[PDB]
C-alpha cells in the first residue's frame, strides 16, 4: 500500500474528517506509518491535531477490520511514548475499546489490542489498575486457555506474555491480590514454555510479583515455581538468567522457610558460576542474593559452606566491580552475625581477612561500617576460643591495623567509635 508513505499531519487530518470510511482508512494508515517511523515520530503533533478520539472510534468498526488494525497500531505507538502521551490515549477511552478487541476474530487485530494494553498498563500503577478494573484479565487469559501453548503464533504469545508481565508490574501499590491470583496459573504455564522470549518475560513477571512483602512472595512460592526458576537460573541466555536471578533474590528476602525452598530446589549449585559470571550486574545480584541467604539460619549457612561458596565470596570480596564488593561485605557481615564459631572460623581459614581489610581503603562510609561490624563479629568468635591475639596478628600481617587506626580519625561517628573500640579492645 504505497499511497500512504510520508503524509503531512494536515493531510492525515483532511482524510480522517471526510465522511468516507476508506479515505479515513488511508489517512489512518498514513498516520500509523508516521508513528511507525524510526526517528522522532511526530507523536505530539498527532495528539495536537485531535486525532485520538477518531482513532479510538475506529477501534469499534467491526465491519472494517483494516481500520481497526491501523488505528490500533497508531494508538499503540502513541501509548508507547511518555506518560503524557499514554494518558492522551487513555483519555480518548481507548481502554474499553481495546479490551473489546481482544475477542476479535482477526488474530493480528487481537494481538494489537494486547500490545496496546501492554503499553498502557506499563506506564504505572494507576493505569495498570485501570486496565484491570475495565476487565482486561478474563479476555487476556482466555486467549491463552489452550491445551498446548505451542499451537499459538510465536509473536502473539510473546506479546501476551509481555503484556501480562506489565499487569504484574510496579509496586506502589502492588497489583490487586485477586488479579495476581487470577494471572498466576497461566503465568506458571508460560514459565514452562520452550520459547526463550516467553521465559524471559515470565521470569520478569515472577520477579515483579515477588518484589514485595512476604505474603506476595508466598502466593508465588505456593504455586511451585521455585524449582523451575532454579532451572532457568542455569540457562545460557542472559535475558533469561537476569530475571530468574532477580526472582530468586527477591524470594530469599522473605522468610527463612521461603529461602529454604530455593536451597531445596538446587539453587546454590549454580552460584559458583553466577558469582564468577562475566556480566557485572549478574555477579552483583548473585552476591546480593547470597547476602540474604547468609542472613538466614545456621543450617542454611551450612548449606552455603557445603556448596563451596565461601571461597567464591572471598573471591568476590578480593576482586569485583565495587558495587558487588559492597554486597560481598554485607554477605560476610550477615554470615558473621548469625553463624556458629566453627562457621566463622572456616570463613577466616578461607582467607577472608586480608581482602576484607583491603576494602577499608574504600571512600564509601557505609561499607566501612559493614566491614568493621564483621571484624567485631569475627573477634567475638575468636574471643570464645582464646585466639583473639592470633587474629590481631593476622590483621597486622596484611596491614589491616594500619587502616583501622586511620579510621579512628574518620569523619563519620559510627565509624570512628567502632574503630576506637577495636584498637583498644584487641590491640
Amino acid at each position: 500500500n504505497q499511497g500512504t508513505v510520508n503524509w503531512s499531519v494536515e493531510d492525515i487530518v483532511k482524510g480522517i474528517n471526510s465522511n468516507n470510511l476508506e479515505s479515513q482508512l488511508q489517512a489512518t494508515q498514513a498516520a500509523r506509518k508516521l508513528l511507525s517511523r524510526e526517528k522522532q515520530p511526530p507523536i505530539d503533533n498527532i495528539i495536537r491535531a485531535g486525532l485520538i478520539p477518531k482513532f479510538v472510534s475506529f477501534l469499534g468498526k467491526t465491519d472494517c477490520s483494516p481500520i481497526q488494525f491501523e488505528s490500533a497500531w497508531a494508538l499503540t505507538n502513541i501509548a508507547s511514548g511518555t506518560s503524557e502521551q499514554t494518558k492522551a490515549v487513555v483519555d480518548g477511552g481507548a481502554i474499553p475499546a481495546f479490551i473489546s478487541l481482544l475477542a476479535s476474530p482477526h488474530a493480528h487485530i487481537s494481538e494489537q489490542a494486547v500490545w496496546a494494553l501492554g503499553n498502557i498498563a506499563g506506564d504505572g500503577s494507576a493505569f495498570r489498575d485501570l486496565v484491570i478494573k475495565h476487565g482486561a484479565i478474563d479476555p487476556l487469559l482466555a486467549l491463552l486457555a489452550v491445551p498446548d501453548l505451542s499451537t499459538l503464533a510465536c509473536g502473539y504469545l510473546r506479546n501476551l506474555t509481555w503484556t501480562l508481565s506489565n499487569l504484574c508490574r510496579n509496586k506502589n501499590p502492588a497489583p490487586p491480590l485477586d488479579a495476581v491470583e487470577q494471572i498466576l496459573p497461566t503465568l506458571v504455564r508460560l514459565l514452562h514454555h520452550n520459547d526463550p522470549e516467553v521465559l524471559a518475560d515470565s521470569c520478569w513477571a515472577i520477579s515483579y510479583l515477588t518484589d514485595g512483602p512476604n505474603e506476595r512472595i508466598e502466593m508465588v512460592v505456593k504455586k511451585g515455581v521455585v524449582p523451575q526458576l532454579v532451572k532457568l537460573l542455569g540457562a545460557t541466555e542472559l535475558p533469561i538468567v537476569t530475571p530468574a536471578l532477580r526472582a530468586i533474590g527477591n524470594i530469599v528476602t522473605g522468610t527463612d522457610e521461603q529461602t529454604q525452598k530455593v536451597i531445596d530446589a538446587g539453587a546454590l549449585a549454580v552460584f559458583p558460576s553466577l558469582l564468577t559470571n562475566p556480566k557485572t550486574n549478574i555477579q552483583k545480584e548473585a552476591t546480593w542474593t547470597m547476602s540474604n541467604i547468609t542472613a538466614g539460619r545456621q543450617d542454611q549457612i551450612q548449606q552455603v559452606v557445603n556448596h563451596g561458596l565461601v571461597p567464591f565470596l572471598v573471591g568476590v570480596l578480593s576482586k569485583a566491580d565495587f558495587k558487588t564488593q559492597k554486597e560481598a561485605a554485607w554477605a560476610i557481615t550477615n554470615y558473621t552475625s548469625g553463624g556458629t564459631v566453627e562457621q566463622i572460623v572456616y570463613l577466616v581459614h578461607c582467607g577472608i581477612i586480608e581482602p576484607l581489610m583491603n576494602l577499608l581503603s574504600a571512600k564509601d562510609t557505609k561499607i566501612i561500617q559493614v566491614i568493621l561490624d564483621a571484624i567485631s563479629n569475627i573477634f567475638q568468635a575468636a574471643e570464645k576460643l582464646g585466639e583473639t591475639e592470633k587474629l590481631s596478628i593476622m590483621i597486622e600481617e596484611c596491614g589491616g591495623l594500619d587502616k583501622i587506626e586511620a579510621l579512628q580519625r574518620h569523619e563519620n561517628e559510627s565509624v570512628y567509635k567502632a574503630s576506637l573500640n577495636l584498637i583498644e579492645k584487641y590491640f
Partner: peptide, 15 residues
C-alpha cells in the same frame, strides 16, 4: 525469529 523484550515498560511497533 529473535526479539527479546528485555524488561521494557513500553514497546513501539516498528514498520
Amino acid at each position: 525469529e529473535a526479539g527479546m523484550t528485555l524488561g521494557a515498560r513500553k514497546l513501539k511497533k516498528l514498520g
